Amino acid sequence: VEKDLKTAYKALYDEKEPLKALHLYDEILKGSPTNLTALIFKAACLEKLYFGFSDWHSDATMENAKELLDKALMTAEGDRSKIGLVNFRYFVHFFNIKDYELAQSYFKKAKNLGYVDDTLPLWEDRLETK
Amino acid sequence: PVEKDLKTAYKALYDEKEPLKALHLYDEILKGSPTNLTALIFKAACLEKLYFGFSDWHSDATMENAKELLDKALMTAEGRGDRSKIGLVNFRYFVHFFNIKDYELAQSYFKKAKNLGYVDDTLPLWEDRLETKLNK
Amino acid sequence: PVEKDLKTAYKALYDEKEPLKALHLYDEILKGSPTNLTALIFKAACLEKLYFGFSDWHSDATMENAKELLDKALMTAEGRGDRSKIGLVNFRYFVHFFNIKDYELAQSYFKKAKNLGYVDDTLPLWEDRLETKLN
């Protein structure tokens, strides 16, 4: 699962191929349905596809992404750093759906839970700008 | 019974937000009750959610299957002469064509459903959404 | 064929001025021809037009996807060694950054394209425009 998740992350963020990464996360989630990384990054794929493909640009894709984050919060709450990650992911979900009010709330939640990421200062300034 | 089984399937799709669990609960209802409008209409809803949420479901075949389930629903509703259920099928058609960005056809089914007396508290929200997509 | 399909997609975006129709058409070309530079470059143009014309598309994710399509285009162009197509992708980058008001980065890509021998009849109009925003 560790190697399979690494190959899927590389497809989404390095290769910048969300359709390939989506398939890879679906396969992981077939075997491991409560895997937080697969649930969190499948939502990331769906958010990228919504904003990059006509056939994916529908409320159903965004609803599915939010529901995957909801399922991850359930599992994470059921790991303080992992419970912090989902909150940062909820922030990325709303910074993209233009709701900066809700995004600021999740950004604070993630930071207060001790979420560490080298992109956090770049996100703070972007959130400060919007 | 079918009433309870339909309630469990609706809860799987809209409350639990698990369209794969709901889809097969609806298949089971359609095995015993092939002409059940709720099972036909909401199996198509499952397929629409799966299309937009799973790679292996993101295919024209999935959307074609959803349309064919709505086709079967219109046949049943029209066969009975249930104006109420015909309006509902026509509204579900509008929703299908709205999500596949065919706003021209969706507007036609929206008018059909409204003219058949379809009542839904979400109709003003849909009316404004369709007016925004159709004004561009 | 791909040549006719690309022509219909270009007409949908620039003549018909329907970027959502053109987007679908470019996605279809990219399904069969993933490394087609014209489909890659103009799918990014669609996404750029949608960003600036639709509330539901006005997101950083849309601009990120457009930039990533231009990135994929530079990979393909550089993979072949096509100086012409490398120059074109750099001009397309200048437009991307010019439109998102990052004139510092746009000036860099405009020079890169001109130095790669990019030929376009609109270059003096752009040269005069970029000089106004950068002055």
Author numbering:
A (entry chain A): 3 to 80, 83 to 134
B (entry chain B): 2 to 137
C (entry chain C): 2 to 136
Text lifted from the article:
Sgt1 is an essential conserved cochaperone of the molecular chaperone Hsp90. The N-terminal domain of Sgt1 is predicted to have a helical TPR fold (Tetratrico-Peptide Repeat) and is responsible for the interaction with Skp1. Skp1 has an N-terminal BTB/POZ domain31 that interacts with Cullin1, a structural subunit of the SCF complexes that arranges the substrate and ligase subunits in close proximity, and a C-terminal extension of around 35 residues, that folds around the helices of F-box motifs.
Crystals were obtained that diffracted to 2.8 Å of a complex comprising Sgt1TPR and a truncated construct of Skp1, Skp1BTB∆. The Skp1BTB∆ construct comprises the N-terminal BTB/POZ domain in which an unconserved loop that is predicted to be unstructured (residues 36–64) is replaced by an alanine-serine linker. The asymmetric unit contains 3 copies of Sgt1TPR (chains A, B & C) and a single copy of Skp1BTB∆. The Sgt1 TPR domain comprises 3 TPR motifs, each of two antiparallel helices (A & B), and a solvating helix (κ). Skp1 sits within the upper half of the concave face generated by the Sgt1 TPR motif repeats. Residues from the α2-helix and β3-strand of Skp1BTB∆ form the interface with residues from Sgt1 TPR1A, 2 A, 3 A and the capping helix. In this interface the α2-helix of Skp1BTB∆is amphipathic and forms a bipartite interface with Sgt1 in which half is hydrophobic, and half is electrostatic. A pivotal interaction in this interface is a salt-bridge between Sgt1-Arg93 and Skp1-Asp35, and our structure-guided mutagenesis experiments using full-length proteins show that mutation of Arg93 alone is sufficient to prevent Skp1 binding in vitro and cause loss of viability in vivo. The three copies of Sgt1TPR in the asymmetric unit form two identical dimeric interfaces (between C-A and A-B) with an rmsd of 1.46 Å in an all-atom superposition. The yeast specific insertion between TPR2A and 2B of both protomers contributes the majority of the interactions of this interface.
